[PDB]
């Protein structure tokens, strides 16, 4: 049941970096009136939400809460997500199992869509290719086979990629080896701050790099790419 606490942090940080107008202090609580989830849906799938049938908080009337959550479920099923034996009132009641399931699929959906936009039709693979190729231009040979690659935990790859993008934002005297859990933790926190220094609006936690959360890895990299292609 400790995974519930980790997912709570993960999706909370992700939602707060999407450019949403609401701020999440606790995903399990702040998501119950359905508004935030509608916002995330509108961001990950533009124009998907019909705001004419939604109610903006604060909300006292329970009807307005159930209505928001039902649109959330509808759009979710329309996107081919997997929601069985649930409805809007499940979100209002705080069904954590459903909330985490809906959030995961939202995160995965956004990631795939981002990759797909790189096509011609972006894909996760195009992002993986860009990162490896970008590092090779600096003369370095370290590469990754995927965004799940275990070696990522060291943080060395990201720092090299960031250095490749803009060498002026990475001070190597400050970087450590990715060996001890402490050393990794240190680079991770450094990576997250340097990326934001470049313009990356990411919300993963330092431990998302140390534990190699592939979904969060994909988005960070894609975000680095985003700003690199505009330099």
């Amino acid at each position: 049941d400790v995974e519930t606490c980790r997912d709570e942090r993960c999706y909370r940080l992700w939602i707060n970096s999407l450019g949403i107008d609401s701020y999440v202090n606790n995903v399990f609580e702040d998501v119950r009136n359905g508004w935030i989830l509608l916002e995330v849906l509108d961001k990950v799938s533009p124009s998907s939400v019909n705001w004419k049938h939604a109610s903006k908080p604060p909300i006292k009337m329970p009807f307005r809460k159930v209505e928001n959550c039902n649109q959330v479920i509808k759009i979710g099923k329309q996107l081919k997500f997997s929601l069985v034996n649930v409805a809007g009132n499940d979100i209002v009641q705080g069904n954590k199992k459903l909330i985490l399931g809906l959030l995961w699929q939202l995160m995965r959906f956004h990631m795939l869509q981002l990759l797909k936009s790189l096509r011609s039709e972006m894909t996760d693979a195009d992002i993986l290719s860009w990162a490896n190729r970008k590092v090779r231009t600096m003369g370095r040979k370290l590469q990754i086979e995927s965004f799940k690659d275990k070696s990522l935990s060291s943080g060395l790859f990201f720092l090299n990629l960031l250095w490749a993008v803009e060498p002026r934002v990475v001070n190597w005297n400050l970087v450590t080896k990715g060996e001890t859990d402490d050393e990794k933790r240190l680079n991770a926190t450094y990576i997250v701050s340097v990326a934001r220094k470049l313009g990356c609006s990411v919300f993963l936690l330092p431990e998302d790099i140390v534990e190699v959360n592939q979904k969060m890895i994909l988005i960070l990299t894609a975000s680095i790419m985003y700003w690199s292609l505009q330099r």
Partner: protein, 374 residues
Amino acid sequence: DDDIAALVVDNGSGMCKAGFAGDDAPRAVFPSIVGRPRHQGVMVGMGQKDSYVGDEAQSKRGILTLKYPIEHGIVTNWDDMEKIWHHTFYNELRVAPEEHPVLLTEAPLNPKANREKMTQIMFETFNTPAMYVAIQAVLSLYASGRTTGIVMDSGDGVTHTVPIYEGYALPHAILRLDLAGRDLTDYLMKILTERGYSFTTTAEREIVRDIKEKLCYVALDFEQEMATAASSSSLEKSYELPDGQVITIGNERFRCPEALFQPSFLGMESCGIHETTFNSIMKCDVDIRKDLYANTVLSGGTTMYPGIADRMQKEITALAPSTMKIKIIAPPERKYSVWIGGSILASLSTFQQMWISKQEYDESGPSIVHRKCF
């Protein structure tokens, strides 16, 4: 590395476990039971959804008819199994079927046309790049300690006795019995309702499943056990309804699993389970039989009954030549073996030359499952 990796889908009578090859545990474990309304249903806070799966079907069990879709291991309802799979990909793993090969598991002795209908659906309805169908007991073995033997596999919808010589099932001597866990939940409820009991509300049709699994026993000698029901004192046990009410069960507890040994109790002409192990053994190579008696392994939820190892032993010992060493094996974990054996298997580069591809399915049709999956 994650996006790309086959999805292993293990289709159990009570539970489904689905994940990604190369992983240590199932990412989605869920209730199968599968429950279809048996009266056009749907809450208006859901799609016209007429298969509820897992726990959202426990909490309407009373208003729904529940299959364990899958029953005695075999699929009885094909559009509600189609629902389950759609939910596996699109809601539980949040995956796209047309980019991942699937390893689906199947019951020992699964009917011909079933193997073909799940090849059919998977290819045409989910547009799967590739697929394979492995028997569940064989992935339990790969994930672990034996190579020659005969397994007696009793799930929810079927039972088979399979002789295996060196990791290879001998298809001529495989025998299928269509009597497994669902047949026994059903027969329990009828002998309990015959005692003027009332399992009248949906959820409580699933309440016989827990008496069955909680109080049933296999008798060594049914006959001296029935009069060691009339010398009562210690045989009746009680079960409590959700309703507050009480059940008392006595001769029923051992009379339920007895339909496995004597399917006349069920109104079936079939031999029981003890004769079918013996009749597969007689169909095998004269020089491995002695190996098959020394390695009789039981697997599946319906083999979990207290007394079944002893009573299987007692009974095979009576039919077997007067010398055979008969060693019935009943490992106490007989919970995730089938899924992690498939996760191992579908991750080896070995396996990609083992699937049935989209190309091959076109080439042959649905029949090809019989050729390539043994």
